[model samples]
Target: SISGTIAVDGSSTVFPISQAVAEEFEGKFPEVKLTVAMSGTGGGFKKFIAEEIDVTGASRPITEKEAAECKAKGIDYVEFQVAIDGLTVVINPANTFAECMTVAELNKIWAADSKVSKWSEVREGWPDEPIQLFGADTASGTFDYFTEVINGKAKSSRSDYTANSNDNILVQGVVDSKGALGYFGYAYFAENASKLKAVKISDGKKAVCVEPTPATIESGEYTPLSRPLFIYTTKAKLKRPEVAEFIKFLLSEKGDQLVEEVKYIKVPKSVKETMQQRLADALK
Candidate 1:
């Protein structure tokens, strides 16, 4: 009979998955109120550690700073892997050249201290116009992931470009501006294909242009940006009947279809098996 508002927030990249889960969960436990919001990965964790949310969705791993803060505040949390996320680099579909970039060139262009400010600075044949960059908000796990792969540090990058935590806005920004180059979760690009173009990255050889499709991600062709997604919740939160049944339904056999439908990769059969056993225990 645990029925109440169960707040959740975090990476916009994970919003769809959570929403899909919400739809499935609510049908069974109609009394439970589930609300999901976007705060980027980093932005959301702040509120989560402050005990503001019963659960937090994230595309990046929790930082040491957040872990320390949680410990200091006695806000203990547990982690769960929701699925895989492919961070897709995109340009206006009109862009022809600059199909992809080398990891070294990528590091140069994205480094906080690098001098590559214009499109031409990063590569020739492109417009010499000022490069309008769109990216994740500093607090986003996507931001952290990009920095780690591109800059070799989590959540580290130049502060020169336009930034937000949500990939949806980044999608809009890149599509609207000509000299704009941006990146975000593959789902955003996949959903907005008419507005975006997936770029090809080089693995020290020829340019490997590929989309962020599930086949591409699982194939390791989406290099550097492919990663797993996660969720974190406190014990008290999951202990609720509403929350318990709801999350249980998410990991349930019936819920698996919805996970795939939402564009998130389904949990592996091995993981699903474990969840099934655990769900039985929790519901009992």
Candidate 2:
């Protein structure tokens, strides 16, 4: 087996899947070292564009600015779509009055210009208690995507809410407060299902409110929150045998299976095949 350090970091949302993949791959090659970290998507891209890491896992596609940075640095990269994640909104388990939230209601509550500060403001007959909002921090791709979907602008949420790059903090924030509401990737929601209630969402108000699940996400019924996950690797790094073999193991069937095992949705066969074609055509 070849030996080298494989640095992988990015979206806290995709950390579980990538970390699991790294662990499994590392076991087979004892001489190789795999270091995985969670730095949120933007932070990851900063490091990636600087060529500090071999791979970056992202919950969303690279933004134009990120792309420009990579191009300017001569970092030609291949994006490997690895899984689908259902962004789940959650409320405290103690909160039984609200079950689902429409796009309009979410906008009214989260938009930067909104004045909603209490549960009853979201809907009539609900608690008059203050609404505690917990969500991803400014650097998180989840934060950017959720704000754009719900507020019609990315990173446009009110400044008063509790935000953190770590989803676990959001989870605990909701778990400790009855009026707290938050959102994170489905895997975190699934793992904390016992402590939090997943809020059914009506995306862009285009469909009926539906809960996020593997089936709903795969069926395209999860709406705006259903998004692709990716792993970006530089062509220069792919030249290293350890990097190449790790990517190989990551795209294999066994690796893809870890998607659902961690509560994220697996990519369809077509996506897998497309990645295979991409690897053969250019990545090597």
Candidate 3:
């Protein structure tokens, strides 16, 4: 019997997919226990390097520093790209002025040492109401991606915003504040669309601001915010029967269905095929 426990922790952005996968995987193999946690990508990596977890979900690729730390700790891991997520920027429904924003405008509001504090400061003809910012904490991969693409550097952002590792709290913060603006995974925004409005993003070079639809995100029409989500597991962990089976199940057709059920786009067939091959190779 494939009976054992598998530990998973990482990005809140990737939590829904991993949770769904774990639930379904557990149903098929009742004896295999899965503990999934969202500790933000960096926080999970800390445990991953410390050899405290069998797997970790990541919204972004492992950083050079993180990889180096794993190497120093003698952790040999493989990264599997599992799904696609459009890093969504959202605003409260009450604020109607910011239907779309250019990347440069986003930078003006979120860049390190930024001084833009009101909607009017962001653009002419918008209200002067104070912009209440909410976003991922420093440990989150969403924070890293958002800061890198919008603010021109990973981890560089104005320090005054409200931040949390939980996307649900950020959603509630945006929903309650009239001028609130925040960014998180598209799945969170999709799940809370009634209370929040997504801001169409222009890469600053494109003539049209693109909204995050499944088609748009999957097609790469959503611009720079469309990103791949990942899972990291070590070679040592794969030797475990339950962990190996869980990985197999995660890359199966049922796994793709769970991704859509969680409102995330599945990786392309070619990418999935490559990952399957990678997993097969690693198992040997």
Candidate 4:
């Protein structure tokens, strides 16, 4: 097991978490090669169903369609919700016309037939500047989750936006363009807080806009954007000692430290325990 390799891909949103774990896992188990790639959730699942990778990181649960594909291929996996995140929407700090937005307003901007192509179009007082959009590529779990929450369905957004699977590219797009807006995981926002401004989101449940803070996300006050992040590994891989050890290390006491270091909210103790038990049972 130590001499074998572990291939991981998926979810640019969850990449940082896997990266943190990968570094530590490599340090402890130098003989095992662990590689993680940011292929976006949908792309990663394509490879996963093809049995090209041992594990995949995901920002959301395996969709029914993806699960069915794996089932047909005889692939079995254990899903773990390792952390919580606020799917952050951001804009250039210089744009002062709009500081917060309602979910309804978001729909108008992203819906497939959206006609709101300028800042002023979203509201009466905003600037008339063209609304330049940046976001995850179509294969991204972030895109799926965002579209589902904001537009009432997955993969149902306008096709005109500038998109990429790399969050860094989207960050640069928003950072360089005053009229640009984009969304990604909270960790990226935290990492670039000085270069960007995370827009407060209002889902109508809150009287005021709520920012994506650890406390706010954990308390579920960050609205519909806050969601759990997950990772799935095949059960066959768990039979390998190194893979099992790596997974255990990811849920260990040190793992909590790494989660915070990457600016992700840790899962509750009960949930963590459940994941641990599930892993243990699978090995049995």
Q: What C-alpha lDDT values do all the predictions have?
A: 0.74, 0.84, 0.87, 0.84
Model 3 agreement with the true structure over 1-284: per-residue lDDT tens digits:
88999999998778888888888888888998899998878889999998989999987799999999999888888999898877899999877779889988999999998988999998987897899999988845578778877887355898899999889999999999999999998889988889889999998675368998887887778988897889999888999989889888888888888987876778999889999999998898
Error of 3 at 117 (Å): 6.9
The parts of candidate 2 lying over 4 Å away from their true place are: 90-99, 107-118, 124-198, 205-215, 219-221
The order by descending TM-score is 2, 3, 4, 1
- Candidate 3: segments with Cα more than 4 A from true spot: 87-100, 107-118, 125-198, 203-208, 211-216, 219-224
- Per-residue error for 97 in candidate 4, Å, reads 7.8
**RMSD each, Å:** 5.8, 4.7, 4.8, 4.8
Query: 1-284, model 2: which lDDT tens digit per residue?
Result: 68899999998767888889888877888889999988767889999998899999986799999999899999998899898877888999888877878888888998988879899888888888999999888745567668867887445788789988788889999999999989887889988889999988875545687888877887778888888889989888888889888877877898788877876778988899998777765553
Specify the highest-lDDT model's number: 3
Pairs of residues at least 3 apart in sequence or in different chains that clash in candidate 1: 42-139, 137-164, 144-155, 200-209
Residue 87, model 4, lDDT: 82
* TM-score of model number 2: 0.71
Q: Sort all candidates by lDDT, best to worst.
A: 3, 4, 2, 1
